[PDB]
């Protein structure tokens, strides 16, 4: 399966502080300038190497010069527009890498927001954009005015402009504070100054006004930004729906739209084999030869081989077959309920396919929404799932799958996952381990394993709330292959005479559990090592 999207682009303005305070050092943490550079580089790398149509502008504030269209003398000073709205390229990446330098001045970030708004308003008149976004990378360590505030908000609601904020610190509450410092890992309210607190209050007020309580979820830190897909959250697009009718019998039909919820992301481009010197594909010929079953080197024509099928110990030639004969004439695209069954009967290990579908009611259909809600709630109440037949179109091979209810506070739907046929099941037999005298663990070994499992827990219960918190959610972590590939490609494009750089530290940090688990597990691991003999075979 592949993702098909609408075809709408977005305009994104990156507002970056380059002021004096965004250069301070500390023995163990990078300066906020470098972290903002890393986040911006990651965003632009993904935009460039995926060949998207989104247009990106870059506005620096805190610079030593002034190149903004609102200067007018003694106003909006030290704000430069380093790049206007256009498709990103390698020149922008080189500029981010080794052309943009820290400044020696300070600028109000609300004036920078005004300049970014002006860029969005006056540079999108001739073009079409479905989303307008501003990402602000600041540290909130400069004096600011509050006069224009209200006007700002009004504009942000008149022109429909979204905002995201990135800061050197997080927005956690009662975090409790806590070897070497690691960036990008999963694991400081007293470390900020009063001006930072005032800036944080104003940022919170703007975010609450624009969106609400959920707006507080759109304030991130650079460290957590490097290990999430948050910078792409407001410019992502969903797939084109699959329209059909859920049929229970031949008299009940519900108009439904299906969307792809899970689908593996793959590299879009491959590597082309080219000549060493000319660096062109035309200097390479790939010809296949069917050299019989020996080295006779007999000339073979393309029509000499007639092809055929195998049915065990016999061969049915292609000359005795017809295209119309072996063709399963499908009845068409369908979504039909074969039956309802207990949820315990359908197990997870039998899930098949390479996609998960979410089924909603058809857009602008109140009756369909009511009917689908009734079906979902009945299934949830009775603890049952619908075994259904699924056909993508009149050419796709029909499959049998399971649809189960999915109720949330903001939406409700069905979830479709494929199920196996008889031919896909392998009936192996394995020896029982619990009933084995040869491999029966002792009590001490069981105690050691219990201690190991206790010390390596990745969850924590909330304080008298019965809520489980995940200390290592891997589902929010991006695939490291894409960032590593982008880094290597950019390094090759900008440093042709250099070897590929090593893997960045923050990728390793985000691929590893918190250091607390590793610290806790050291002693039970030693006990397990001293209790379980493990000798390699000497064949």
């Amino acid at each position: 399966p592949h993702m098909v999207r609408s075809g709408n682009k977005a305009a994104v303005v990156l507002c970056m502080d380059v002021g004096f305070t965004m250069s301070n050092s500390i023995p163990g943490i990078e300066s906020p300038f470098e972290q903002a550079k890393k986040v911006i580089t990651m965003f632009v790398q993904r935009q460039v190497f995926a060949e998207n149509k989104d247009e990106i502008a870059l506005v620096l504030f805190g610079t030593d010069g002034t190149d903004n269209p609102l200067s007018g003398g003694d106003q909006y000073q030290n704000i430069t527009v380093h790049r206007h709205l256009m498709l990103p390229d390698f020149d922008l990446l080189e500029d981010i890498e080794s052309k943009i330098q820290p400044g020696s001045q300070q600028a109000d970030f609300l004036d920078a927001l005004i300049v970014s708004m002006d860029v969005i308003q006056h540079e999108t008149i001739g073009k079409k954009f479905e989303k307008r976004h501003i990402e602000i990378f600041t540290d909130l360590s400069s004096r600011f005015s509050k006069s224009q505030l209200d006007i700002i908000i009004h504009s942000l609601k008149k022109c429909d402009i979204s905002l995201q904020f990135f800061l050197p610190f997080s927005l956690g509450k009662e975090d409790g504070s806590g070897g070497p410092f690691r960036l990008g890992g999963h694991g400081p309210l007293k470390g900020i100054t009063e001006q930072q607190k005032e800036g944080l209050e104003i940022v919170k007020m703007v975010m609450i006004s624009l969106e609400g309580e959920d707006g507080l979820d759109e304030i991130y830190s650079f460290s957590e930004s490097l290990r999430k897909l948050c910078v792409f959250k407001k410019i992502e697009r969903h797939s084109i729906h699959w329209p059909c009718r859920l049929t229970i019998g031949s008299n009940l039909s519900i108009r439904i739209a299906a969307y792809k919820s899970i689908l593996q992301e793959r590299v879009k481009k491959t590597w082309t084999v080219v000549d060493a010197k000319t660096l062109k594909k035309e200097d390479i010929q790939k010809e296949t030869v069917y050299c019989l079953n020996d080295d006779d080197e007999t000339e073979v024509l393309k029509e000499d081989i007639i092809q055929g099928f195998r049915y065990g110990s016999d061969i049915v030639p292609f000359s005795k077959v017809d295209e119309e004969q072996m063709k399963y004439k499908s009845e068409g695209k369908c979504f039909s309920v074969l039956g309802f069954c207990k949820s315990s009967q359908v197990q997870r290990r039998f899930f098949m396919g390479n996609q998960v579908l979410k089924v909603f009611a058809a857009r602008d259909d109140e009756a369909a929404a009511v009917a689908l809600s009734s079906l979902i709630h009945a299934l949830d109440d009775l603890d049952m799932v619908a075994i259904v037949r699924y056909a993508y179109d009149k050419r796709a091979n029909p499959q049998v799958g399971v649809a189960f209810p999915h109720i949330k506070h903001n939406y409700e739907c069905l979830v479709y996952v494929q199920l196996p046929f008889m031919e896909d099941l392998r009936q192996y037999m394995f020896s029982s381990l619990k009933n084995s005298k040869k491999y029966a663990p002792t009590e001490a070994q069981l105690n050691a394993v219990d201690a190991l499992i206790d010390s390596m827990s990745l969850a924590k219960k909330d304080e008298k709330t019965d809520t489980l918190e995940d200390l290592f959610p891997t589902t929010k972590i991006p695939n490291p292959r894409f960032q590593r590939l982008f880094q290597c490609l950019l390094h090759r494009a900008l440093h042709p005479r250099e070897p590929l750089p090593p893997i960045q530290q923050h990728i390793w940090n985000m691929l590893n559990p918190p250091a607390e688990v590793t610290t806790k597990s050291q002693i039970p691991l030693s006990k397990i090592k001293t209790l379980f003999p493990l000798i390699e075979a000497k064949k």
Binding site: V4, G7, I240, P243, K333, R363, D364, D365, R395
Partner: protein
């Protein structure tokens, strides 16, 4: 010179260097004349030259299906004292793509006068060469004034390819259906949509004028939908409002052809916005039903491929099998 009428059917054919390889044999056949004003010789015995002229006509005529020559040659001698029209050259073909011709091959050509004259109320033809003319035209053998004019006459029946059809509109007037566009104002397209996961309609039918406006006539349930009189500005609008089961298709993508082609007029120039023809009288509905039936009959043998593209990422492609018929309408 291929003389073509308004119906595309050849009427007059003049040859100069085409029968020079046959005249000697034809004269050798001619000597068996003994005091006959207009002699007739059956060619059931000497049918070789019949085959030779058949081969020549097959080679030098366009869009030929069958040539049925008659096995009789009529030799006529013309003297300085003669004047003939027969004044009764009226004859209506029974079918559409078939025609009977008279073939005159000159044996002894007059040196000065007495050519053959062919009449038609848009121009007149006078010729003194090997001629082949339909039986629907009045002809004159002009009064020769010197020598003698000895000619040979064959009878020819030719059936061409079926590029012409007739449909009855009312008692008085009928309508002509043509496979190709030439001075035709209206085009009917019978469309079968290839299987796509977004398309919920199999077959449709539209009428398009040169302005590009489209009127839906049939949706595989008959011609009932033409009663609603749904008119769209183009074919993309017809697809947007007809073949998609969801609510707002225009919000998801836009349909266009990447080669600037039209479903009916190909790479032509659409006119400015004009009124679109719609059926008002029961005769119009009967004609529309007949046209839809005929188009459905031929939809499995003749059709072409049309492609529409939706600006998705990746782009979506819709494939249509189109059967087109071009026609005119009375004022």
């Amino acid at each position: 010179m291929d003389i073509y009428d308004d119906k595309g059917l050849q009427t007059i054919k003049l040859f100069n260097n085409e029968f020079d390889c046959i005249r000697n044999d034809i004269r050798e056949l001619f000597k068996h004349v003994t005091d006959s004003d207009s002699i007739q010789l059956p060619m059931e015995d000497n049918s070789d030259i019949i085959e030779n002229i058949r081969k020549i006509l097959y080679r030098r005529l366009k869009n030929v299906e069958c040539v049925d020559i008659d096995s009789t040659i009529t030799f006529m001698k013309y003297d300085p004292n003669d004047d003939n029209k027969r004044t009764c050259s009226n004859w209506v073909p029974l079918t559409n793509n078939y025609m009977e011709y008279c073939l005159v091959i000159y044996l002894e050509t007059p040196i000065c006068g007495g050519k053959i004259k062919l009449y038609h109320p848009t121009g007149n033809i006078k010729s003194d060469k090997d001629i082949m003319f339909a039986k629907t035209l009045d002809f004159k053998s002009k009064k020769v004034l010197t020598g003698r004019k000895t000619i040979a006459v064959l009878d020819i029946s030719v059936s061409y390819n079926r590029s012409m059809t007739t449909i009855h509109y009312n008692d008085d007037v009928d309508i002509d259906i043509h496979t190709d566009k030439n001075g035709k104002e209206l085009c009917y397209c019978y469309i079968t949509i290839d299987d796509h996961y977004l398309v919920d309609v199999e077959t449709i039918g539209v009428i398009v004028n040169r302005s590009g406006k489209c009127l839906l006539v049939n949706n595989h349930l008959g011609i009932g939908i033409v009663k609603d009189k749904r008119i769209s500005d183009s074919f993309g609008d017809v697809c947007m409002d007809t073949i998609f089961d969801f609510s707002e298709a225009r919000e998801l993508f836009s349909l266009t052809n990447d080669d600037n082609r039209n479903i009916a007029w190909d790479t032509d120039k659409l006119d400015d916005d004009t009124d679109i023809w719609t059926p008002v009288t029961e005769d119009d509905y009967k004609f529309l039903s007949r046209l839809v039936l005929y188009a459905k009959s031929q939809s499995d043998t003749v059709f072409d491929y049309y492609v529409l593209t939706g600006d998705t990422e990746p782009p979506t492609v819709f494939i249509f099998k189109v059967t087109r018929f071009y026609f005119n309408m009375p004022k």
